[PDB]
Amino acid sequence: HVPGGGSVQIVYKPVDLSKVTSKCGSLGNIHHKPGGGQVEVKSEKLDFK
Amino acid sequence: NKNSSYFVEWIPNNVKTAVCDIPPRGLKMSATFIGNSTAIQELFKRISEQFTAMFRRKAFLHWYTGEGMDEMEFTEAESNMNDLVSEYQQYQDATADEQGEFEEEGEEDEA
């Protein structure tokens, strides 16, 4: 007679991470509009015919 | 903290607390322990060798077969206890370090 059993195997799945996006707001915007254009407002026309 | 060697390392912080207001009659305060250790390997280690000591020689066994049991069943009770003591000994001092399949991809080779 061969005496019974004496054999198991481990309940084991290794852990890892997939498709974890680096979605931080650290560079979250790029858009700009200038603070108006350059103009002259200080001078008269002096249009005395 | 002082007994780190007596806890298994991949179950963290191995304690269940719980507190009742009401003590046992005739004690001002008490606590109950229910500890689950690998140490119980000892029970199943001793009993399954004593069991192979018996069924290997069909000793005491005529009384039970004599009630309608079969030798397959002694084998399956044994098969399982030996399997069970092998499961508690698989986890006796089982690593928090990764277990098995330690093989890899190599280096790029000239063609």
Side-chain angles (χ1 to χ4, degrees), chain B residues 76-88:
Chain B
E76 203 180 56
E78 172 175 82
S79 289
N80 199 9
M81 177 184 274
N82 286 296
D83 288 346
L84 195 49
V85 75
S86 301
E87 213 177 47
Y88 287 103

Side-chain angles (χ1 to χ4, degrees), chain A residues 33-48:
Chain A
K33 181 169 181 172
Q38 297 189 2
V39 293
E40 213 318 76
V41 300
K42 301 182 301 300
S43 310
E44 223 304 89
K45 301 192 299 179
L46 307 177
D47 195 21
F48 309 115

Side-chain angles (χ1 to χ4, degrees), chain B residues 102-108:
Chain B
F102 184 87
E103 298 176 63
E104 58 295 279
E105 195 94 56
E107 298 192 58
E108 193 162 82

